[PDB]
C-alpha cells in the first residue's frame, strides 16, 4: 500500500537540531497512524514518537512520545506533501542511530515495533561532540 522513504540524515554537532522527513509514495500518508523508531549500531530498536491522522483541533494530530524524547521531539504532519517530520532538539551522543518511520492502520499494539504495516529505508544520524 505505501512506500516510505526517510531523509535528513547526517552528521550533526552535540546541540544542534536536525529535521527529517518520513516521505510516502504510492498512497497518501493521510489515512495511516506514522510512527518513529531509531536503532542505534547494537541495540534493539526503540520506539520514539508517533502521529495520529485524525484532527484533535484545527491545526493538531493526536501525537505520543516516549519518555527519553519527549519535549526534545516534536513529530508533524503534512498531508499536502505527503511527508511527517520529525524536529529533533538538543541532540546527544547517544542519539546517535539509523531512524525510520513506519505505517500502520490502527491505534492499537501501542509503542513496540512489532505491529507495523510498511517501514521505510533508515536515515543515519551522528552526533558528534
Known amino acids: 500500500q505505501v512506500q516510505l522513504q526517510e531523509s535528513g540524515g547526517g552528521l550533526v554537532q552535540a546541540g544542534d537540531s536536525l529535521k527529517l522527513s518520513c516521505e510516502a509514495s504510492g498512497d497518501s500518508i493521510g489515512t495511516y497512524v506514522i510512527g518513529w523508531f531509531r536503532q542505534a549500531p547494537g541495540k534493539e530498536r526503540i520506539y520514539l514518537a508517533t502521529?495520529?491522522?485524525?484532527?484533535?483541533?484545527?491545526?493538531?494530530?493526536?501525537?505520543r512520545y516516549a519518555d527519553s524524547v519527549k519535549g526534545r521531539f516534536a513529530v508533524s504532519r503534512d498531508n499536502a506533501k505527503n511527508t511527517v517530520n520529525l524536529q529533533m532538539n538538543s541532540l546527544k551522543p547517544e542519539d546517535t542511530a539509523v531512524y525510520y518511520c513506519?505505517?500502520?492502520?490502527?491505534?492499537?499494539?501501542?509503542?513496540?515495533?512489532?505491529?507495523?504495516?510498511?517501514w521505510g529505508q533508515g536515515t543515519q544520524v551522528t552526533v558528534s561532540s
Open positions: 502521529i495520529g491522522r485524525n484532527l484533535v483541533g484545527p491545526s493538531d494530530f493526536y501525537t
Open positions: 513506519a505505517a500502520k492502520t490502527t491505534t492499537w499494539g501501542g509503542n513496540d515495533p512489532n505491529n507495523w504495516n510498511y
